[PDB]
Structure formats: structure tokens, C-alpha cells
Amino acid sequence: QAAADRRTVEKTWKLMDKVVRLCQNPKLQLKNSPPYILDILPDTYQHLRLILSKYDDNQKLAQLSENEYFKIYIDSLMKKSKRAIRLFKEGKERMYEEQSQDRRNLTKLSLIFSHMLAEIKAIFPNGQFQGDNFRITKADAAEFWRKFFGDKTIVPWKVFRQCLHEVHQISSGLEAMALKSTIDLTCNDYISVFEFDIFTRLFQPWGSILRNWNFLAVTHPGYMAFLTYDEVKARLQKYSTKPGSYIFRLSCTRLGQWAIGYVTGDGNILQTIPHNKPLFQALIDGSREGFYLYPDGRSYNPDLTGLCEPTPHDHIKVTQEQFELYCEMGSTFQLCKICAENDKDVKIEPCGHLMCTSCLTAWQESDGQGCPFCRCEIKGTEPIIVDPFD
């Protein structure tokens, strides 16, 4: 709410440095794994310095301090830092017991700080504001945001709830609160375009998003809220004796993607990410081959078969204009221009460029990154059918 001037930002730097000092206490014995508070906060400091360096003169700084997202970000960073400091003070010697509730609260705060850092990097890439140019991954989700919010970067939860409810009914106030805790990754009662992108990637397809979220997160005993890689390994340790035990949660290092942890034969805990592949299918195939059998160690494993009818790949119709164009080149529009062999059957999101799945898979398998045609991050894909003009 307050204007984020240079003075207000530096105040956050002090609070953050104190939190870092508190976390550098040898007695904590924090593990060097994401989310790692001793990485996140100095990295947050660096990115805020970068932002200030791009907004150098008086006019730019006044502009920066009036940026809606940035005001909210700075205020959240301030609140969360004070919360962290408060945690150590009241927590006392409980901070040194891993199993305590106070440490769990530190782990939660670390996740939030990690989510915030990834957010400010997406919104202020290279320290310059690009929030109004952010590209939502899923086309239908992108269109929803543009219709109700235009190019806004961030909106109050209450406003977001109303607009979402207009398109996808929220059944109760209780469902709304649960929905808020899932999408509000930074825990600031606002919904950023970045959080909206993560939520819609995780729970696609958009057409039945709230139904998907209910089946995958609300009524599924496998779903773990705000857990880390280490917490998953620790939680599943109780079920080392029962192979097939599995849980899933949001990946911390690859936001918008799922991490599935499972107990193997015999006894070891592994975690995997089905990269940009729908979780429903991954759980179905995992259950079929006897890998994911006991969600959170429980006896019954839910059947998700056909709980997501794929709204059949929207056909793209090669126009006469294009046909003639590729004809003048001795080629066709439909042909994949990477292999020159198969036809285009996948659309890369958010850039929209087309190629075949075989080449996309081969590209990513060879450690290649970004769309071949524009280098934009491949945040999602949609299967498509190109109908030949012939």
C-alpha cells in the first residue's frame, strides 16, 4: 500500500539481512537444497539491487515506487521478513528441533520467499518491469485474464474470485478458501499473473479447471500442500516398508510443474517430474505399471480414468493463401520444418509455434531448450491436427 521509494526498499534489505543472520546460526543445520533460505534472500537482495539500478533518476524511481505490483511485493517482503524474525524470537530453542512446528513455519516461509523470488524475476526480468507483457501459457487461461484484467500484473483475491466464479462456479465459501490457499503461492491475498500461470499450468485443461483441482488436490490423499523435496522424502520414510507409496506436490525449482515422490522396490524414495505432461495421465500410467499404488501410504488408490475427456485437439485449417505459399516453395504448411518428415502435430506455448512431437521430444532429450523458432521458453504444449488444404 505504501509507495516503494528507495528508502522503503533499503529498509527491507535490513530486515532480510537479519533473517539471513538468524538462519546462519550453526544450530539450525539447514540442508543445502531448494528452497534454501541462505540462497533465496541474498538472491532476492541482488535482484532488488538490479531493479534499482535500472530505475536510476528521480522520474524513473517515482514511477517504480508507484508500480502496483512492486508496492505489493515490497510490502509482502517486509511483512514476511518481520514474521521470520518473530518466528525465531518466540520460537526460541524450538528452532533447533527439526520436527517442531516453528521449524515447519520456517520451511513454509522459505517456500514463500522462493516463490516470491521466481515471481519478481518473471515480472522484472533483468530488473526492468515487464509485468504488462507477461505471456500466460495456456491459451484459454490467457484469454480469461485478458478479458477480465487486461494487461494488469496483479489483482486482489476478492476481485479474482468474482471473475473466476463468473466462468467457473465456485460451490461454497469453504471451497473458495481452499482454492485461495492453492493459487495464492506468495500468501499475500493478491493474485499475480505469474501465480495464475502456475495454477492453470498445474490444473489444465482450463475448461474443467476447478473440477481437475478438486480431483487432484482437494479429494486426493496424494496431494501435499507446500511441501519441499526434503519433506517429501521424510514423510515417505514412514512408508519405506510399503513400496508403491506415493505423494505429489508443486515442484519448487520448476514452478508450474508436478513432482511425484514414490517408494520403489525395494525401499528407496525417488522423485520425478513429468515435464509439461498432464498429471492425470501420469498418475494413471504410474498406477497401471504398479509404481503409484498407495497415495500417502493409504490402501485405496483413486481411479482418475476418463475424469478428463480431452476436448479433442482444435483443428487448424490450412488456408488457401498458405497452401499456395508453401506450394511456391515446393513444400506444405502441414510439414514439420525441423525433420521435414512428419507433419506438425504439437503447438508450443505460449509462443504458438508448431512442429511434430518427435522433434520436440528429440530436441529436449538432447538438452536443447526453448522453441526452435523463437527461443521462447517451452512452458506448455497442446496436441493439434493440421488439416491439409488438399
Binding site: 537444497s33 531448494p34 523435496y229 525449482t253 513432482a259 514414490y262 520403489t264 525417488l270 522423485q271 520425478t272 517430474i273 513429468p274 501420469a282 504410474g286 505399471e289 509404481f291
Partner: peptide, 9 residues
């Protein structure tokens, strides 16, 4: 490494 292994198949 990140601690993530290939999908079980």
C-alpha cells in the same frame, strides 16, 4: 543434479 530422476516406466 536436482534430485529428480526419470519417470518410472
Amino acid at each position: 543434479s536436482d534430485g529428480y530422476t526419470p519417470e518410472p516406466a
